[PDB]
Amino acid sequence: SFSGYLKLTDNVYIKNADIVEEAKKVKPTVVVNAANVYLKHGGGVAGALNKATNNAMQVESDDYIATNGPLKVGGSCVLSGHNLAKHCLHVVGPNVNKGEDIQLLKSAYENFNQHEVLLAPLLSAGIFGADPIHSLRVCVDTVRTNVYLAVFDKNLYDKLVSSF
Numbered sequence: 001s002f003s004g005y006l007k008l009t010d011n012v013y014i015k016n017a018d019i020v021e022e023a024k025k026v027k028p029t030v031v032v033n034a035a036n037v038y039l040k041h042g043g044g045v046a047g048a049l050n051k052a053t054n055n056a057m058q059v060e061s062d063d064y065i066a067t068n069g070p071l072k073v074g075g076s077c078v079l080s081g082h083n084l085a086k087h088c089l090h091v092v093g094p095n096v097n098k099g100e101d102i103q104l105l106k107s108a109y110e111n112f113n114q115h116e117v118l119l120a121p122l123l124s125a126g127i128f129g130a131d132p133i134h135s136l137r138v139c140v141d142t143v144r145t146n147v148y149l150a151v152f153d154k155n156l157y158d159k160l161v162s163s164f
């Protein structure tokens with residue numbers, strides 16, 4: 001049910017789209033959230049996904065952290081997708097603005113390999129401070145499952161396609 005995606009490789013597809021609107025339309029099995037270790041969904045992709053669930057994602061995440069403690073940078077957990085998807089794979093890419101190791105980006109993308117098909121953003125991009133061109137390269141060289149990337153910014157989308 002994904003449509004209008006540009007094929008980059010055998011298993012990586014990309015589209016200039018708002019990931020919230022794309023999730024509401026497609027209702028995929030898995031939507032990836034650009035999470036932090038605390039599952040505090042304040043801004044960026046995480047804030048936008050949580051707002052679309054009417055804060056139900058935050059309530060569920062706070063119960064998860066109270067039981068399990070924080071995730072690792074490069075780690076993930078599977079929670080409900082609420083009204084946006086069957087499941088949400090919360091994945092923690094390194095946040096370069098908070099001083100985290102960029103080599104953990106490959107570990108973060110490895111979490112996608114546990115799911116046959118996913119709707120996802122580029123990890124560690126945007127407010128996480130990493131170079132999105134680097135993030136797309138690690139994605140294509142690490143994920144073997146079918147990933148549909150939603151890039152919110154039109155100008156960044158055009159730069160990613162032109163330089164791929």
Ligand SMILES: O=C(O)C[C@H](NC(=O)c1cnc2[nH]ccc2c1)c1ccc(Br)cc1
Nearest residue numbers: 018019020044045048121125126151152153
């Ligand atoms: O989409 C991405 O590639 C990641 C990131 N997106 C958001 O922060 C983001 C924020 N608010 C949102 N409301 C609905 C979707 C949505 C996404 C981003 C990165 C670089 C630039 Br320039 C712009 C946006």
